């Protein structure tokens, strides 16, 4: 029988004594945006080095 | 009281059609004794199968409101 699943939000809670304190972030990978690149390059005429 | 007639019932429709004349309360305890002598006729003791599928029989529908059972 093909019941509906009614699903409400539910609000996970804690208590105070259970609640965790913090996880400390250390830092894996220096966080990079930018990184280089080999590209080629073409002298002024527009022709190629 | 159509389907009282038509499962062979003359008496009885005439006492509840005639009583509604008047309405009168006096006369009323009839309608009382009448709704007593159906529960000395005896029982349906019918099977376990049948029994549990007069229950057991659903239609249940993604067509409800969900504002009715959240409140619920």
């Not at chain 2, 004349?21 to 305890?29: G, H, M």
């Not at chain 2, 159906?38 to 019918?46: E, T």
């Given at each position: 029988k093909t019941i509906p699943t009614f699903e409400p939000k539910e609000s996970i809670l804690k208590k105070l004594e259970d609640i965790k304190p913090e996880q400390v972030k250390k830092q894996t990978?220096?966080?990079?945006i930018f990184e280089p690149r080999q590209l080629p390059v073409y002298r002024a005429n527009g022709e190629k080095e | 009281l159509d389907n009282m007639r038509k499962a062979g019932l003359t008496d009885i429709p005439k006492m509840i059609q005639d009583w509604l004349?008047?309405?009168?309360?006096?006369?009323?305890?009839l309608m009382a004794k009448i709704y007593s002598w159906?529960?000395?006729?005896?029982?349906?003791?019918?099977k376990m199968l049948d029994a549990a599928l007069d229950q057991l029989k659903t239609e249940y529908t993604e067509?409800?409101?969900d504002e009715m059972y959240r409140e619920y």
């Open positions: 990978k220096l966080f990079r | 004349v008047d309405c009168s309360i006096e006369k009323f305890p159906s529960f000395h006729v005896g029982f349906r003791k019918q067509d409800v409101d």
